């Protein structure tokens, strides 16, 4: 009741785990197993659904004019009931059981916010879809989650987050370089189940490598990206090159023309089935 602060935790890294010779491993939502309900877990993923900051009460303060002893009840669930009956230490030894009122000032609140963490694209198995999970945050961490990013959330699993953060190999790159004609080899290496078209897929190689984002540092940003059109007649394969580009490159999402595309390209609104709010 007299808590001026807010207590939070953070786990140890892998650099402190190899030193002195686990507790903080990057966990998937498919790697939850059910039995991890109550362990601190560090989940990695994109954030698609976020909600507004809302004040959720923790303790309800009731005041009386007859006795003066203000009482405080503690809520734990999503809902509660108003304690109209007086449970003070003076009304127990009395015939009178006078009315009680609520105080929105002495009651302790918390900045509650729900969020939906989603499964990472290359961490999902073959054929499966990236299912979601719910994270319930409270306090000062309420503005550390802006949608459209990758995050590592460390918290207990009831998800009550405590701390958030956001973002052999040399032999593998030097043996790819030393063979000679690196550009043409990397061009003809991707999607070899089709015939020819080295130029189109060579520009697809330059498309997925991206380019350089330029900032003038005066409030103006230009694009450092390429956008490629494939206009063609039927008979030659078109979905295979598109599927190979989305399978090789990370975070590739296959779309369509009609269907739910109108709501599949913008943010629409819907009613949450777990609580009375619009997301």
């Amino acid at each position: 009741l007299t808590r001026r602060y807010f207590l939070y935790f953070k786990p140890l890294s892998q650099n402190c785990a190899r030193r002195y010779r686990i507790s903080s491993k990057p966990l998937s939502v498919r790697q939850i197993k059910g039995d991890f309900l109550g362990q601190l877990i560090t989940v990695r993923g994109i954030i698609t659904r976020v909600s507004d900051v809302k004040p959720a009460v923790e303790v309800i303060a009731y005041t009386c004019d007859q006795c003066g002893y203000e009482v405080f009840q503690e809520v734990n669930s999503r809902t509660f009931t108003p304690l109209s009956e007086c449970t003070s230490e003076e009304c127990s030894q009395n015939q009178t059981k006078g009315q009680l009122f609520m105080s929105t000032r002495a009651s302790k609140f918390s900045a509650f916010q729900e969020c939906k963490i989603q499964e990472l694209s290359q961490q999902v198995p073959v054929g499966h879809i990236p299912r979601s999970l719910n994270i319930h945050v409270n306090g000062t961490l309420v503005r550390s989650l802006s949608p459209g990013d990758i995050v590592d959330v460390t918290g207990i699993f009831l998800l009550e987050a405590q701390f958030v953060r956001q973002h052999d190999v040399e032999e593998r790159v030097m043996e790819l370089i030393t063979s000679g004609d690196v550009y043409n080899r990397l061009a003809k290496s991707i999607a070899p189940e089709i015939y020819g078209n080295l130029d189109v897929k060579k520009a697809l190689l330059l498309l997925l490598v991206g380019g350089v984002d330029k900032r003038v540092g005066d409030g103006m940003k230009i694009r450092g990206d390429i956008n490629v059109c494939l206009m063609g007649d039927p008979g030659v394969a078109k979905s295979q090159l598109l599927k190979a580009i989305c399978k090789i490159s990370p975070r590739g999402v296959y779309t369509t023309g009609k269907g739910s595309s109108g709501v599949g390209l913008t943010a629409a609104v819907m009613k949450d089935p777990v609580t009375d709010e619009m997301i």
Binding site: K54, P55, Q99, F101, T104, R105, F109, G219, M278
Partner: protein, 586 residues
């Protein structure tokens, strides 16, 4: 003596006083208790002044504290600031109808003629299952009547602080605050969150900041940089250093955001220094850049685009609120941007039904809605910045009034047009590519805000003679109304209170540099011919194309043919039809 029970109290006086520093630090956390005990103490000190008692014994008096320091809106309102005093500065956008709140509750019984009056206890009504035991017993015979109940006024008001806060006013403060004014408001922050207003400030020896604060050294730097000669181009170079020269276009948007002079009469007249600009010509240049840059300069404006903004989206509308299940008068895009500029792209692809509202805001600067639920004329003080495209894909062989596919009197009502055509050649595009790769090799808003609110220039009679002759050159009233606002904007910059004779010269050069037949003639000619030779019957598509390439010479390509034909017909310079059928214009 006049019956005003309200008392306006300044808390700053309680702050500087030697004895009450413990009172100012006690009312910021608990206003509900101190207002309730202040109502008793003000009545006690007033009856001490009295010692008229027949009415002040039952009368109630309250206190409205407003002199508190500023805050960062609703963003700084953390949960430790609940039930504390707070102040918000902004503008209100919507005033809901008055809702009633119960003060005492009526309870009519069905039997034994005994009615019961009870009072509200901060939100709950004690419904008695008992029926006054001195009288007869009844377990549930009890009713509730709404018409004999006493009510008090309540009203929820939308406020733009950008965030939209739902504030709520109570009795004796209803219909005093409504949409359209810059309002300072103060009250108690509650929790969905809201603010329970204790005072409003409809008006504005104090240090209350009105405009963006400047110092004396910055004012001296403004006066020293305003005395130079090249300032007229310096600003036009400093408004956008990432793109090219565009002297007339950049000078026009510079004086467009300078504004001009807005003068009115006492009761029935108003005039605003304003210019509505349009851009047309060759594509793929800095047009959208400007359309975004100005949205990043003004504090009020919307980026409306093409067919995605109809008549229900431009002006105000009515819909349903999901948070309170009522009717919400949602503010429109032309009234959201009341002040500043408003940017429209793809003017030619916009529909004709929504062109009628911009036909009124061209020079009238008003919105007159007469529909179901609303008959309201309102302010549309903003200026439009529209980017358009010509017909096809530029053609100098066709006139300017036909190439951009629009009606001429509405365009005559436009204050400023801009031919932003490229006309590609040597020594101009080479420097363009060099300046775009030169960055690949490796105070203004304060001066504008001071000049817009500190200079009211008058247009004297001394510049009469050069204006008459500038008008007759375009005549050999909308152009005159545009050029006087252009000349007063010329007087607005470089710190001038009196307009000068040289200032209109450049203005006219501006509108003369901003705007800088064989085909159709033969066409019609032939059409006439084959008409004549047809005994006036229709000319065929075929025969048309035939004689038109036939007389061969200037090579009229059947596609070009198709195009110009389309033009005359659409110009109603022709009237013809069919697929592979051609009909001579009538």
């Amino acid at each position: 003596e006049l019956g005003t029970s309200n008392l306006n109290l300044d808390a700053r006086n309680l702050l500087a006083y030697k004895q009450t520093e413990d009172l100012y630090h006690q009312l910021l956390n608990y206003p509900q208790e101190v207002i309730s005990i202040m109502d008793q103490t003000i009545k006690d000190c007033m009856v001490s002044l009295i010692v008229d008692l027949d009415e002040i014994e039952t009368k109630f008096y309250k206190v409205r504290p407003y002199n508190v320091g500023s805050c960062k809106g609703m963003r700084e309102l953390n949960p430790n600031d609940i039930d504390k005093l707070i102040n918000l500065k902004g503008l209100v956008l919507r005033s809901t109808p008055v809702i009633p709140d119960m003060k005492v509750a009526f309870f009519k019984c069905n039997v034994c003629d005994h009615t019961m009056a009870v009072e509200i206890d901060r939100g709950v009504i004690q419904e008695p299952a008992r029926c006054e035991r001195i009288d007869c017993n009844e377990p549930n015979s009890m009713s509730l009547i709404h018409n004999r109940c006493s009510f008090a006024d309540k009203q929820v008001i939308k406020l733009q602080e950008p965030h939209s806060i739902s504030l709520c006013v109570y009795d004796e403060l209803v219909d005093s605050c409504r949409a359209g004014d810059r309002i300072e408001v103060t009250g108690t922050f509650r929790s969905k969150t809201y603010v329970d207003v204790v005072h409003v400030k409809k008006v504005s020896h104090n240090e209350v900041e009105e405009v963006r604060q400047i110092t004396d050294q910055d004012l001296a730097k403004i006066r020293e940089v305003a005395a130079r000669e090249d300032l007229y181009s310096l600003l036009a170079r400093s408004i956008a250093p990432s793109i090219y020269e565009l002297e007339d276009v950049k000078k026009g948007i510079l004086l467009q955001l300078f504004g001009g002079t807005n003068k009115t009469f006492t009761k029935g007249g108003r005039y605003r220094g304003d210019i509505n600009i349009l851009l047309c010509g060759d594509p793929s240049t800095s047009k959208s850049q400007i359309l975004q840059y100005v949205h990043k300069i003004t504090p009020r404006g919307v980026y409306t685009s093409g067919k995605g903004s109809s008549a229900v989206g431009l002006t105000a509308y009515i819909t349903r609120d999901v948070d309170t299940k009522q009717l919400v008068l949602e503010s429109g895009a032309l009234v959201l941007s009341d002040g500043g500029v408003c940017c429209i792209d793809e003017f030619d692809k916009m529909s004709d039904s929504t062109r009628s509202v911009l036909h009124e805001v061209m020079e009238q600067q008003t919105i007159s809605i007469a529909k179901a639920g609303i008959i309201t004329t309102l302010n549309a003080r903003s200026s439009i910045l529209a980017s358009a495209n010509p017909i096809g894909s530029y053609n100098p062989n066709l006139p300017v009034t036909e190439n951009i596919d629009l009606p001429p009197p509405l365009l005559s009502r436009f204050d400023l047009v801009y031919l932003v055509l490229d006309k590609v050649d040597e020594k101009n595009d080479r420097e363009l590519a060099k300046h775009l790769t030169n960055l690949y090799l490796e105070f203004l808003t304060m001066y504008i805000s001071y000049a817009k609110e500190h200079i009211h220039p008058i247009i004297t009679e001394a510049a009469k003679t050069e204006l008459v002759r500038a008008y007759v050159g375009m005549r050999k009233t909308r152009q005159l109304e545009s050029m006087i606002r252009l000349a007063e904007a010329h007087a607005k910059m470089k710190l001038k209170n009196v307009v000068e004779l040289e200032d209109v010269q450049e203005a006219v050069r501006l509108i003369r540099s901003a705007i800088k037949r064989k085909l159709q003639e033969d066409l019609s000619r032939e059409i006439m011919n084959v008409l004549k030779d047809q005994a006036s019957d229709s000319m065929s598509f075929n025969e048309l194309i035939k004689q038109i390439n036939e007389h061969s010479q200037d090579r009229v390509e059947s596609s070009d043919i198709q195009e110009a034909l389309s033009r005359l017909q659409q110009e109603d310079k022709v009237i013809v039809l069919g697929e592979g059928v051609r009909r001579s214009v009538r």
